[PDB]
Design an enzyme around this catalytic site. Structure first.
Site, PDB file in Angstrom:
ATOM      1  N   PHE A 177     -18.267   6.277  -3.689  1.00 53.48           N
ATOM      2  CA  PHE A 177     -17.790   4.928  -3.941  1.00 53.48           C
ATOM      3  C   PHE A 177     -18.292   4.049  -2.803  1.00 53.48           C
ATOM      4  O   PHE A 177     -18.196   4.443  -1.656  1.00 53.48           O
ATOM      5  CB  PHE A 177     -16.261   4.803  -3.984  1.00 53.48           C
ATOM      6  CG  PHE A 177     -15.582   5.410  -5.218  1.00 53.48           C
ATOM      7  CD1 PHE A 177     -16.179   5.278  -6.483  1.00 53.48           C
ATOM      8  CD2 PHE A 177     -14.299   5.957  -5.094  1.00 53.48           C
ATOM      9  CE1 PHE A 177     -15.505   5.758  -7.609  1.00 53.48           C
ATOM     10  CE2 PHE A 177     -13.616   6.430  -6.196  1.00 53.48           C
ATOM     11  CZ  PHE A 177     -14.223   6.330  -7.440  1.00 53.48           C
ATOM     12  N   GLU A 231       3.650   0.772   3.046  1.00 53.19           N
ATOM     13  CA  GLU A 231       3.529  -0.224   4.115  1.00 53.19           C
ATOM     14  C   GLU A 231       2.844  -1.453   3.512  1.00 53.19           C
ATOM     15  O   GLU A 231       2.430  -1.449   2.371  1.00 53.19           O
ATOM     16  CB  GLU A 231       2.792   0.366   5.305  1.00 53.19           C
ATOM     17  CG  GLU A 231       1.393   0.760   4.970  1.00 53.19           C
ATOM     18  CD  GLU A 231       0.733   1.550   6.081  1.00 53.19           C
ATOM     19  OE1 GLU A 231       1.432   2.131   6.927  1.00 53.19           O
ATOM     20  OE2 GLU A 231      -0.512   1.632   6.080  1.00 53.19           O
ATOM     21  N   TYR A 258      -8.846  -2.070  -9.333  1.00 53.41           N
ATOM     22  CA  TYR A 258      -9.853  -1.455 -10.186  1.00 53.41           C
ATOM     23  C   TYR A 258      -9.315  -1.349 -11.605  1.00 53.41           C
ATOM     24  O   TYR A 258      -8.098  -1.259 -11.820  1.00 53.41           O
ATOM     25  CB  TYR A 258     -10.228  -0.051  -9.685  1.00 53.41           C
ATOM     26  CG  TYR A 258     -11.110  -0.181  -8.524  1.00 53.41           C
ATOM     27  CD1 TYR A 258     -12.463  -0.508  -8.695  1.00 53.41           C
ATOM     28  CD2 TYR A 258     -10.589  -0.085  -7.243  1.00 53.41           C
ATOM     29  CE1 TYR A 258     -13.298  -0.704  -7.608  1.00 53.41           C
ATOM     30  CE2 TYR A 258     -11.405  -0.284  -6.165  1.00 53.41           C
ATOM     31  CZ  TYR A 258     -12.749  -0.602  -6.362  1.00 53.41           C
ATOM     32  OH  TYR A 258     -13.692  -0.882  -5.375  1.00 53.41           O
ATOM     33  N   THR A 298     -10.668  10.395   0.118  1.00 52.72           N
ATOM     34  CA  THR A 298     -11.899  10.028   0.812  1.00 52.72           C
ATOM     35  C   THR A 298     -12.135  11.025   1.921  1.00 52.72           C
ATOM     36  O   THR A 298     -11.263  11.272   2.761  1.00 52.72           O
ATOM     37  CB  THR A 298     -11.861   8.566   1.284  1.00 52.72           C
ATOM     38  OG1 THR A 298     -11.633   7.813   0.113  1.00 52.72           O
ATOM     39  CG2 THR A 298     -13.198   8.215   1.937  1.00 52.72           C
ATOM     40  N   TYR A 321       0.858  -1.163   0.000  1.00 50.23           N
ATOM     41  CA  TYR A 321       0.000   0.000   0.000  1.00 50.23           C
ATOM     42  C   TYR A 321       0.903   1.223   0.000  1.00 50.23           C
ATOM     43  O   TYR A 321       1.833   1.314   0.784  1.00 50.23           O
ATOM     44  CB  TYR A 321      -0.887  -0.029   1.252  1.00 50.23           C
ATOM     45  CG  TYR A 321      -1.803   1.185   1.263  1.00 50.23           C
ATOM     46  CD1 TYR A 321      -2.934   1.239   0.450  1.00 50.23           C
ATOM     47  CD2 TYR A 321      -1.509   2.281   2.038  1.00 50.23           C
ATOM     48  CE1 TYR A 321      -3.733   2.342   0.390  1.00 50.23           C
ATOM     49  CE2 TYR A 321      -2.358   3.412   2.009  1.00 50.23           C
ATOM     50  CZ  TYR A 321      -3.469   3.394   1.185  1.00 50.23           C
ATOM     51  OH  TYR A 321      -4.261   4.556   1.161  1.00 50.23           O
ATOM     52  N   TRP A 354      -8.067  -2.026   6.593  1.00 49.41           N
ATOM     53  CA  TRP A 354      -7.779  -0.681   7.078  1.00 49.41           C
ATOM     54  C   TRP A 354      -9.051   0.133   7.268  1.00 49.41           C
ATOM     55  O   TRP A 354      -9.976   0.080   6.448  1.00 49.41           O
ATOM     56  CB  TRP A 354      -6.920   0.062   6.073  1.00 49.41           C
ATOM     57  CG  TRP A 354      -6.347   1.365   6.587  1.00 49.41           C
ATOM     58  CD1 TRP A 354      -5.132   1.556   7.162  1.00 49.41           C
ATOM     59  CD2 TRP A 354      -6.977   2.681   6.534  1.00 49.41           C
ATOM     60  NE1 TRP A 354      -4.951   2.888   7.434  1.00 49.41           N
ATOM     61  CE2 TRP A 354      -6.067   3.597   7.030  1.00 49.41           C
ATOM     62  CE3 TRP A 354      -8.203   3.162   6.042  1.00 49.41           C
ATOM     63  CZ2 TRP A 354      -6.367   4.984   7.116  1.00 49.41           C
ATOM     64  CZ3 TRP A 354      -8.462   4.534   6.099  1.00 49.41           C
ATOM     65  CH2 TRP A 354      -7.567   5.406   6.657  1.00 49.41           C
ATOM     66  N   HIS A 362      -8.193   9.862  -5.662  1.00 49.04           N
ATOM     67  CA  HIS A 362      -9.220  10.513  -4.857  1.00 49.04           C
ATOM     68  C   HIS A 362      -8.747  10.672  -3.430  1.00 49.04           C
ATOM     69  O   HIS A 362      -7.863   9.962  -2.973  1.00 49.04           O
ATOM     70  CB  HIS A 362     -10.531   9.795  -4.925  1.00 49.04           C
ATOM     71  CG  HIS A 362     -10.436   8.404  -4.505  1.00 49.04           C
ATOM     72  ND1 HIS A 362      -9.958   7.429  -5.354  1.00 49.04           N
ATOM     73  CD2 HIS A 362     -10.669   7.808  -3.325  1.00 49.04           C
ATOM     74  CE1 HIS A 362      -9.958   6.257  -4.737  1.00 49.04           C
ATOM     75  NE2 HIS A 362     -10.365   6.466  -3.505  1.00 49.04           N
ATOM     76  N   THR A 374      -4.602   7.326  -1.952  1.00 45.17           N
ATOM     77  CA  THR A 374      -3.933   6.104  -2.348  1.00 45.17           C
ATOM     78  C   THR A 374      -3.282   6.259  -3.710  1.00 45.17           C
ATOM     79  O   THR A 374      -3.887   6.758  -4.662  1.00 45.17           O
ATOM     80  CB  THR A 374      -4.989   4.998  -2.427  1.00 45.17           C
ATOM     81  OG1 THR A 374      -5.529   4.810  -1.158  1.00 45.17           O
ATOM     82  CG2 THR A 374      -4.362   3.674  -2.902  1.00 45.17           C
TER      83      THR A 374
HETATM   84  N1  LIG Z   1     -16.110   1.910  -8.042  1.00 48.73           N
HETATM   85  C1  LIG Z   1     -14.866   2.293  -7.587  1.00 48.73           C
HETATM   86  N2  LIG Z   1     -14.533   2.287  -6.283  1.00 48.73           N
HETATM   87  C2  LIG Z   1     -13.215   2.689  -6.032  1.00 48.73           C
HETATM   88  C3  LIG Z   1     -12.319   3.081  -7.000  1.00 48.73           C
HETATM   89  N3  LIG Z   1     -11.174   3.349  -6.392  1.00 48.73           N
HETATM   90  C4  LIG Z   1     -11.341   3.149  -5.124  1.00 48.73           C
HETATM   91  N4  LIG Z   1     -12.634   2.740  -4.872  1.00 48.73           N
HETATM   92  C5  LIG Z   1     -13.120   2.535  -3.558  1.00 48.73           C
HETATM   93  O1  LIG Z   1     -13.362   3.637  -2.906  1.00 48.73           O
HETATM   94  C6  LIG Z   1     -13.476   3.248  -1.402  1.00 48.73           C
HETATM   95  C7  LIG Z   1     -13.560   4.457  -0.580  1.00 48.73           C
HETATM   96  O2  LIG Z   1     -12.237   5.031  -0.547  1.00 48.73           O
HETATM   97  C8  LIG Z   1     -12.812   2.125  -1.339  1.00 48.73           C
HETATM   98  O3  LIG Z   1     -13.282   1.190  -0.347  1.00 48.73           O
HETATM   99  P1  LIG Z   1     -12.392   0.208   0.537  1.00 48.73           P
HETATM  100  O4  LIG Z   1     -13.340  -0.498   1.466  1.00 48.73           O
HETATM  101  S1  LIG Z   1     -11.225  -1.068  -0.530  1.00 48.73           S
HETATM  102  O5  LIG Z   1     -11.505   1.266   1.338  1.00 48.73           O
HETATM  103  C9  LIG Z   1     -10.337   0.850   2.014  1.00 48.73           C
HETATM  104  C10 LIG Z   1      -9.269   1.907   2.061  1.00 48.73           C
HETATM  105  O6  LIG Z   1      -8.374   1.798   3.025  1.00 48.73           O
HETATM  106  C11 LIG Z   1      -7.305   2.786   2.686  1.00 48.73           C
HETATM  107  N5  LIG Z   1      -6.083   2.304   3.303  1.00 48.73           N
HETATM  108  C12 LIG Z   1      -5.253   3.018   4.120  1.00 48.73           C
HETATM  109  N6  LIG Z   1      -4.160   2.307   4.374  1.00 48.73           N
HETATM  110  C13 LIG Z   1      -4.293   1.087   3.723  1.00 48.73           C
HETATM  111  C14 LIG Z   1      -3.502  -0.058   3.657  1.00 48.73           C
HETATM  112  N7  LIG Z   1      -2.250  -0.121   4.303  1.00 48.73           N
HETATM  113  N8  LIG Z   1      -3.883  -1.037   2.868  1.00 48.73           N
HETATM  114  C15 LIG Z   1      -5.023  -1.004   2.226  1.00 48.73           C
HETATM  115  N9  LIG Z   1      -5.878   0.039   2.275  1.00 48.73           N
HETATM  116  C16 LIG Z   1      -5.487   1.106   3.009  1.00 48.73           C
HETATM  117  C17 LIG Z   1      -7.530   3.234   1.458  1.00 48.73           C
HETATM  118  O7  LIG Z   1      -7.675   4.621   1.385  1.00 48.73           O
HETATM  119  C18 LIG Z   1      -8.679   2.569   0.858  1.00 48.73           C
HETATM  120  O8  LIG Z   1      -9.507   3.155  -0.085  1.00 48.73           O
HETATM  121  P2  LIG Z   1      -9.008   3.768  -1.494  1.00 48.73           P
HETATM  122  O9  LIG Z   1     -10.325   4.144  -2.154  1.00 48.73           O
HETATM  123  O10 LIG Z   1      -8.129   4.923  -1.197  1.00 48.73           O
HETATM  124  S2  LIG Z   1      -7.954   2.364  -2.496  1.00 48.73           S
HETATM  125  C19 LIG Z   1     -12.577   1.496  -2.680  1.00 48.73           C
HETATM  126  O11 LIG Z   1     -12.913   0.206  -2.881  1.00 48.73           O
HETATM  127  C20 LIG Z   1     -12.665   3.035  -8.391  1.00 48.73           C
HETATM  128  O12 LIG Z   1     -11.993   3.264  -9.366  1.00 48.73           O
HETATM  129  N10 LIG Z   1     -13.982   2.688  -8.586  1.00 48.73           N
END
Ligand SMILES: Nc1nc2c(ncn2[C@@H]2O[C@H](CO)[C@@H](O[P@@](=O)(S)OC[C@H]3O[C@@H](n4cnc5c(N)ncnc54)[C@H](O)[C@@H]3OP(=O)(O)S)[C@H]2O)c(=O)[nH]1
Length: 140
Positions: free
Chosen positions: A64, A132, A98, A106, A4, A138, A104, A38
């Site tokens: 999202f 990390e 994805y 959040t 990550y 998370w 983005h 991210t």
């Molecule tokens: N449709 C669609 N959805 C999208 C798209 N891109 C994203 N999303 C979704 O948007 C959600 C709201 O953010 C989100 O939900 P999660 O349940 S997987 O959130 C878990 C989250 O933990 C954060 N975090 C912090 N530290 C760590 C760590 N060490 N390891 C792992 N995660 C870590 C992190 O920030 C992350 O979210 P992230 O979005 O930054 S990858 C996604 O699935 C897209 O292109 N399209």
């Protein structure tokens, strides 16, 4: 396991993000310490080398869904910097979960039933990247 990577923000960027959260009266706001964007979300680990740039200057609100089935409100950006850093990780071998990398920030991981829309001008300045292990569980 995995990898990550996210970016953290300057103080002025954090202040602007918090003002945005307050303006929207957002439930469950992401706390200041947890605001990030991210770059890498990879099930495999690669030797990604972490990094005063404004990296984005505006964004749109997007909802999202999260793994848990809650609705998250994000500020979605166009960022050449973040997209190139994501592609660097990909070139090393990192995976992503994805079909498109949509950088983005959040703003809340659980907005309940509320709806939001808007286009904001926010100077997004990165303070540092950090890496990390991938933490599928998370939360903020
Ligand atoms: N449709 C669609 N959805 C999208 C798209 N891109 C994203 N999303 C979704 O948007 C959600 C709201 O953010 C989100 O939900 P999660 O349940 S997987 O959130 C878990 C989250 O933990 C954060 N975090 C912090 N530290 C760590 C760590 N060490 N390891 C792992 N995660 C870590 C992190 O920030 C992350 O979210 P992230 O979005 O930054 S990858 C996604 O699935 C897209 O292109 N399209």
């Amino acid at each position: 396991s995995g990898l990550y990577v996210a970016a953290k923000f300057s103080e002025s960027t954090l202040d602007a993000l918090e003002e945005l959260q307050r303006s929207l009266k957002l439930p469950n706001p992401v706390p200041r310490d947890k605001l990030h964007t991210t770059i890498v979300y990879s099930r495999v680990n690669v030797p990604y080398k972490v990094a005063s740039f404004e990296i984005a200057d505006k964004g749109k609100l997007t909802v999202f869904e999260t793994q848990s089935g809650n609705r998250a409100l994000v500020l979605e950006m166009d960022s050449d910097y973040l997209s190139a850093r994501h592609s660097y990780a990909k070139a090393l071998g990192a995976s992503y979960d994805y079909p498109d990398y949509r950088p983005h920030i959040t703003l809340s991981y659980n907005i309940g039933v509320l709806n939001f829309s808007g286009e904001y001008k926010v100077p997004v300045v990165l303070d540092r990247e950090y890496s990390e292990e991938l933490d599928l569980e998370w939360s903020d």
